[PDB]
Paper text:
Here structural analysis of hydroxyketoacid aldolase from [name] [name] ([name]) revealed a dynamic movement of the metal cofactor between two coordination spheres without protein scaffold rearrangements. Holo‐[name] forms a trimer of homodimers, in which each monomer adopts an (α/β)8 triosephosphate isomerase (TIM) barrel fold. In total, holo‐[name] contains six equivalent active sites; each of which is formed from amino acids from two different domain‐swapped dimers. The transition from M2+ R to M2+ A,S is induced by bidentate substrate binding and occurs without a concomitant rearrangement of the protein scaffold.
Docking studies did however reveal a potential docking site, close to H44. The docking does however support the earlier proposed function in the pyruvate deprotonation, studied by H/D exchange. In both cases 100–300 fold improved deprotonation rates were observed. This could be enabled by a phosphate in concert with H44.
Author numbering:
A (entry chain BBB), C (entry chain BBB), F (entry chain BBB): 0 to 251
B (entry chain AAA), D (entry chain AAA), E (entry chain AAA): 1 to 250
The structure:
């Protein structure tokens, strides 16, 4: 009866999260049982549709991590349907303005404050009869910052009451700033924009998260005081692992 | 051409991947690496027929030969996989000459076997001349994973329509009364594995083995195994995630 | 060659409809064969995606009820794709203004009147060569009223020619009015808003429907003159049935 | 711990649900009620392997022991379900000692049985010590639903690696030449059911029975059945919908 | 009423479609044409159990009798399809009297067969009186596609609980040592087909045949075949696409 | 390492494309192996959802045709998710204005020019390390013209840099112009509108495509100088083929 990520935050500790682009329940449960606080299912940059995400949410919860979803789009109806299938964290892409941040917030919180239509099939099964009274505490909402526009509007985005904070896509932001889409980019202008977003989030009493393609980059983001750090995509980790096995198999 | 048969004909072994996770994205990604084949495991996995069919397509597009380790040595299951574009079959728990004949029966059209004719996907790959070359398009391996199979190895190896045998050494270790550890050092298990390889090669047949690491696969390739698998997607992903978490958390 | 709900209405009788949150064909056919006029597949408050709804529509039609869908969102493209998969009724959520009601109407009716793109795979198979001439008669459209805003705008929503009327979500409306989200709520201010919506719908010569969580509440709504009454969700009925079986099994 | 085995060890019977409808939402909802187990029916249903795998996860998360009544008493089917996190197996049409041995063979690793080693989901639940306790993590029941099974009951009950027997009384009623009605009063069927229960308990084994109502389940629990199912999701949903329509329409 | 049995009782043959492509849209479209039945092929196809179940519903809604050519002559597979609303079964590779008895066993409730009782979809179509008329609701055909089946035709035809036999002439052609061409002119294959039809009709049983063209189907209907299939969806779609491309490109 | 449709266009030849309304991999591969340059998966007028389209894209590529998709809606997030699953052509429905054309263009092209979020799972596997440098060349984008509005706005739609041109739905346009929704319509006012769209596209140095229900209509469109011609839907071709087989089987 607690959001493991919110528990980290209440204890003044960051959360570390997995990131899934591969559909299916077996790896979702296996990674959830590791020392991840949360596992993010990527519904944007992946072939994962609503039918495949539903059982993955169950597998992550059984594994003992907080099931999160990076949605395809910042659409209230998509977000609310995921919340009712038992997503306890939402990362909404392309939140560029305060109004888009307000749209995310609307989807996360019960009417009349939010417009979250009531029908909590899975949350009411997990939280029991105590759910409705603490329902907002059960869910984490992060607005994705991945554009020039979002960067310029960071303070108005952070001003929105009903979001926990923001989530940086460093490669997506590098590309929108006119740089190479390097995994775990350290391009100086992107490094500077990222540091600005983290400063403004902590200045507003809000959380800041970031996507990492490696354990090494995630270690640095944790040291820099990021509150929510993802590492690393299942497909990327599996492809790298297979490449290393083949090289060792084929070595003189 | 069957890329594994191409390896063998050019005098080199095949290195293969091993998938227990369903879906097309990782199957294509791994097939595009320096694997000659990718085995889809329909036994020690939740991969059912519906999920295997597009995975076979993904492996072929990625540039590896699609193989299936079947749930069971059942002719009608095997034939449906061949018609879906499985070009390699690894049949579990082949323990007797009769069971190896059952496998051989599934892999060949009459008069050589009793394979039903309806080659939906192979006929698209090979065209209207498929029948004449059908047997050579597919590689068939009988799994050796029990004391009984070990006792019956020459009788199994005598069956004409199988390419050879594939050692399941974790199951074999367990059946011999040892720890079911992959890549085992247990002297009796190592001896049995070497014995199967020698008997296969003496009978002019191929021998494969399931491996859990690149380092063990390198040794098996050095010992002259024709078909070596390393390592299951779920095992490699789990190990990689554990290492990323250790790096992140310091 | 008739919409069973429209047949009820033409005979001056209300329609009673089932409500499905569980994906699959077997229970959809079984409930369709009961004395339901229609069965509503809930694509909003459920894990039911487009791939699972398509065969459920077939199962409901074979069972001999009118297949209806409560859409995830009032989006024309989603609605038109359901109509072409053989949804003969649409309930659109969160219709709060005349313009949102016009958007629903646009999706229900053939170009140029509506913008219903032409490609009626399943309807043309059911209705045959007579379909196009009577196609608007084959489909029922209800705008969901579940907000303060929709309540204030009820007359402008009801003014839209191409919708059959409105569908009340009593729990969703209770919550937006600042009350407890009680199943089959009789909270006085919600009771009053619901009676106002029914009065204004009948005043405009339009139909009014309502969601019920029980046969008892549905009986009262039918007596109050509601034209389309749903009772009760498959998950709710199955959970209650199992709870009663266990209590009888475990009783002294 | 297997919650059904926990019931038995603490001297109480298990009450189980019975699912013929595929999907995770109702499976989790019913598992969260006061059921010790939830049986997924893969025989008298459209539930295939792809649909069962996430249903097992949903039942375990809801707090009941996931059981499967298999389509058939086939070792390789049973083993794939065990590796998917089926912790109870009810095998249909077990009619002879040989067929009960076939069931027992699937449920245990060598040397006790021939269960293939690849415990994808149990190893996540039980960890690396799974092998040592594997047999106790799973409950195996042979279904008695024919005159032949009734005639061979002591020979079936003699097989070491099965927990006992599960009566399918509608099939049994039909095979005895009576109406296939659930929860039957037919004297010969009632007598046969009592006979099986007595023989099971005399042989120190468990006996279960399929029920269509809470009232019948209460009697079976009173008569000392160890494992009682009530009632199929589709039957309960259909009855509930009929009652709601009767209430609505007056 | 089984529409194929209605054809036979009114003294006309049945013409059936044949589906190798999964999904409901084409299954309903083809069932709405002047086909008496539509056969779903679960053998020479990627159609698994999950995909067949809604296809049966689509065929019935479209106004044809849903039939399945099973992957294999396996009683438990057949029974699950009957409970899903398969009203016709074509069992492949029925080669002996024993194998025909195995088929017959699956199609009938005790005492006539050993069909397990759980008629999920038939009980919705036929209601509570289903048991009494169950056997007549289903049509069972043993496939003749081997020299062995041809040699054992009268022994196969002697089995009481099968309606008759369905010739797989491409497999039969191949097994006789000829080209596996549909609608063949090969004299020995044509002679064998005629022989099977004569023996079936002499034994008071029905005979069907798989066809690749309307023109061949017309001849078979003229020769007195009771059940004629023309032609597979994938073959017809491929031929139609080739013709559209030829018309477009000139 | 080339878009087969772009190859046609660079050689000054039209492309001929298949059109799939039936889900599944077997017919998709079989038709892709025929003399089609591209095969279009119809996600609008079909029951094909995201889960079924993903493997169909693979089957078409393996068959040796360019995998295209006609999207349910002109939504950037839906389009980008298809591009990352290996759609190399996009047909967006109901593009009625320059702004809707700009929205399509935004989805097709990498940030910062487009807003195409970076995560090319399948394209980077096909094109290898050379992908990012030539990524815009790998994808074809066509704005669907199927309304009076789109017809009036054709020049402002064609003015948008980042679209390859337009795709005519003759039946959809006939219906919006107040005519019969005839397959391969030759209704004079629709014939005139279609000729105007082709003239204005070629006048703007842009490509024009068209949907055909037959090989005969497609032959005429190819002769009229259309750059991209689809013929004919799998369901339509299969239904016609089965009808002809039955008539030949049942003939005296
Ligand atoms: Br860990
Ligand atoms: Br990123
Ligand atoms: Br590599
Ligand atoms: Br032997
Ligand atoms: Br092994
Ligand atoms: Br391993
Ligand atoms: Br009723
Ligand atoms: Br409500
Ligand atoms: Br309870
Ligand atoms: Br016995
Ligand atoms: Br029973
Ligand atoms: Br029952
Ligand atoms: Br016709
Ligand atoms: Br015989
Ligand atoms: Br044949
Ligand atoms: Br053919
Ligand atoms: Br061609
Ligand atoms: Br059109
Ligand atoms: K889906
Ligand atoms: K964890
Ligand atoms: K490769
Ligand atoms: K009804
Ligand atoms: K429980
Ligand atoms: K018909
Ligand atoms: K081609
Ligand atoms: Mg709502
Ligand atoms: Mg055959
Ligand atoms: Mg359109
Ligand atoms: Mg094994
Ligand atoms: Mg039974
Ligand atoms: Mg992005």
């Amino acid at each position: 009866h607690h959001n493991k990520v919110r528990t980290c935050w209440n204890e003044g500790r960051p959360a570390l999260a997995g990131w899934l682009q591969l559909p299916g329940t077996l790896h979702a449960e296996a990674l959830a049982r590791l020392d991840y606080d949360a596992v993010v299912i990527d519904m944007q940059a992946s072939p994962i549709d609503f039918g495949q995400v539903a059982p993955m949410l169950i597998a992550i919860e059984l594994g003992g991590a907080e099931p999160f979803v990076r949605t395809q789009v910042n659409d209230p109806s998509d977000i609310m349907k995921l919340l009712d299938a038992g997503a306890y964290g939402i990362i909404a892409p392309m939140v560029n303005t305060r109004a888009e941040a307000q749209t995310l917030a609307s989807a996360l919180h019960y009417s009349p404050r939010g417009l979250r239509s009531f029908g909590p099939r899975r949350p009411s099964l997990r939280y029991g009869s105590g759910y409705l009274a603490q329902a907002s505490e059960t869910v984490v909402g992060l607005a994705m910052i991945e554009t020039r526009e979002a960067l310029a509007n960071i303070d108005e985005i952070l001003s929105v009451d009903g979001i926990d904070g923001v989530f940086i896509g460093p490669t997506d932001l590098a590309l929108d700033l006119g740089h190479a889409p390097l995994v775990d980019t350290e391009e100086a202008e992107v490094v500077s924009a990222i540091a600005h977003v983290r400063e403004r989030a902590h200045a507003a009493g809000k959380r800041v998260g970031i996507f990492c393609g490696s354990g090494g980059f995630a270690r640095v983001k944790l040291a820099e005081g990021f509150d929510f750090v993802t590492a690393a995509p299942d497909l990327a980790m599996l492809s790298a692992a297979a490449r290393q096995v083949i090289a060792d198999a084929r070595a003189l």
